[PDB]
């Protein structure tokens, strides 16, 4: 199937309480594999998945060097953005960055990414062409000018199309036991009386991986999007995910309703009904 590698980074200032806290995590699809936290005892990038532990000491030394350099860069950039936005030095501010690559079953590059946000709003993003930028405002335009002057996009494109995809291929192989296994959802429907006139039918999907999944209710074969309560997909804590969808049905009309489930671990889409 298709796969992805993504790195996430967050720096948060805290005026009067030391230097900004920096946290970064790396994922393959929905599997967390490395982390680094500046507030940790002895900050070092640490392994979080069995298949990455084989990497040798030079891997961990170099990764750690990079992480530390990103923390310092963010600290300088947080000051820079205070100037760009004519802001006081009294408040807490946030800088976020995500980069990575997506590949198809054949292992070739499908799309690359590199984007930044300031205080939770889009700041600047490398376009899908991996050669041009989208700036959100005149502040981000100042960064764009500097990045266009330093040929930054050229640097990112090289990485994204080369190293990023090659690391992904390597990790997929070393972690094939888990990274290339899709766990299908375990599904069932529950009935919860609301009043003598109605009850909720709740369709459950449990123990699945990866996270992507579609759950829908139909009434007489008609989608009930507007009348369905759909909770966000949530982590179970053991690598797998959970999700449910619910609809309010009048007493005795339970059989007009059907739950539909699509997941990559299922050869055919599922159809379920409440069973008294």
């Amino acid at each position: 199937g298709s796969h992805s590698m993504r790195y996430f980074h967050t720096s948060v200032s805290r005026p009067g309480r030391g230097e900004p806290r920096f946290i970064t995590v790396g994922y393959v699809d929905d599997t967390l594999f490395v982390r680094f936290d500046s507030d940790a005892a002895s900050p070092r990038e640490e392994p979080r998945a069995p298949w990455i532990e084989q990497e040798g000491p030079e891997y961990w030394d170099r990764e750690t060097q990079i992480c530390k350099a990103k923390a310092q860069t963010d600290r300088e950039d947080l000051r820079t953005l205070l100037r760009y936005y004519n802001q006081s030095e009294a408040g807490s501010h946030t800088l976020q960055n995500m980069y990575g690559c997506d590949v198809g079953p054949d292992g070739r590059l499908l799309r690359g990414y590199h984007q930044d946000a300031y205080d939770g709003k889009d700041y600047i993003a490398l376009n899908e062409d991996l050669s041009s930028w989208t700036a959100a405002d005149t502040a981000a335009q100042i960064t764009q000018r500097k990045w266009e002057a330093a040929r930054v996009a050229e640097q990112l494109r090289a990485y994204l199309e080369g190293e990023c995809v090659e690391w992904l291929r390597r990790y997929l192989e070393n972690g094939k036991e888990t990274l290339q296994r899709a766990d299908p959802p375990k599904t069932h429907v529950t009935h919860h009386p609301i009043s003598d006139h109605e009850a909720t039918l709740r369709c459950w999907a449990l123990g699945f991986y990866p996270a992507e999944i579609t759950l829908t209710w139909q009434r007489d074969g008609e989608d009930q999007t507007q009348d369905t309560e759909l909770v966000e997909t949530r982590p179970a804590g053991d690598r797998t995910f959970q999700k449910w969808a619910a609809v309010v049905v009048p007493s005795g009309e339970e059989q007009r309703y059907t739950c539909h489930v699509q997941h990559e671990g299922l050869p055919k889409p599922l159809t379920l009904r409440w069973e008294p």
């Binding site: 891997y59 170099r62 990764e63 950039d77 960064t143 500097k146």
Partner: peptide, 9 residues
């Protein structure tokens, strides 16, 4: 493995 070039805003 991460991208290693430092790029100041």
């Amino acid at each position: 493995g991460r991208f290693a070039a430092a790029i100041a805003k």
